[PDB]
């Protein structure tokens, strides 16, 4: 367990990171404090809830379709019978929300105690209702269910490690899905962005959760900020998770 300084890559925003390598067993922290901290996952939680559906048969394919049913919504990419592959990148949260209506609470509740995924706490399984957007909400969003950069990590690793149930074929669908052009072809860079706020603390939660692989190495990892600048989103804090992975992991 290294402590390290990443603040140079954060440009000023506040937050942290930690990279675990199972591996060679290197954990390195930056802002420790923080990355021990449970926060809401948001959007970072499409990760998990595309294998729940996938292993519940909701979906099959990184082409399956969740039966748009013309709903106008300001993302024009959401107005459409958008499939798998297409939902996680555009972050479409109709899509999502209709595949975990799907799935039984106690099936879902068993998925997330077995991958230790933080506080396993879905009581508030329709969201933040109080925010006003009503079924563009659910537990994952700045509600009842909270995970630390730490525990994303480790859940990261034991799925694609191979060391939870889920079947090969969805895991390496979810690797399909997960992969991001990062402009150097040496490296493999994986992930999911999540943007959220946080209205008791006047915080942002933005992230940035998934592996790397680097010539034989692995590493799994996330990056979190919690700037009170509202600014900050999911997609910034890609960024500067991609400006740490070149500085410090090439």
Not at 179 to 198: E, H, L
Request: charged share 30%.
């Amino acid at each position: 367990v290294n402590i390290v300084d990443y603040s140079d890559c954060f440009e000023g925003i506040s937050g942290g990171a930690i990279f675990c390598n199972t591996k060679n067993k290197e954990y390195n922290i930056y802002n420790k404090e923080l990355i021990e901290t449970r926060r809401s996952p948001c959007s970072t939680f499409k990760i998990v809830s595309t294998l729940i559906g996938l292993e519940k048969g909701v979906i099959n394919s990184k082409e399956s379709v969740m039966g748009y049913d013309g709903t106008d919504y300001p993302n024009k990419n959401w107005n459409k019978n958008l499939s798998l592959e297409e939902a996680f990148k555009e972050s479409c949260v109709w899509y999502y929300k209709k595949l975990i209506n799907k799935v039984d609470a106690k099936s879902v509740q068993n998925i997330l105690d077995d991958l230790k995924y933080g506080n396993c706490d879905i009581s508030e399984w329709e969201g933040d209702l109080k925010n006003g957007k009503g079924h563009l909400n659910g537990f994952w969003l700045e509600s009842s269910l909270q995970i630390s950069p730490k525990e994303q990590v480790q859940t990261m690793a034991k799925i694609f490690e191979g060391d939870t149930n889920f079947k090969k074929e969805h895991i390496n669908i979810l690797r399909d899905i997960m992969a991001i052009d990062v402009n150097d072809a040496n490296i493999n860079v994986y992930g999911k962005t999540g943007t959220g706020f946080d209205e008791k603390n006047k915080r942002v939660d933005a992230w940035f959760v998934g592996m790397l692989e680097r010539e034989g190495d692995t590493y799994y990892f996330a990056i979190k900020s919690d700037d009170s600048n509202k600014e900050i989103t999911g997609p910034k804090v890609k960024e500067i998770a991609i400006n740490i992975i070149k500085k410090y992991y090439s």
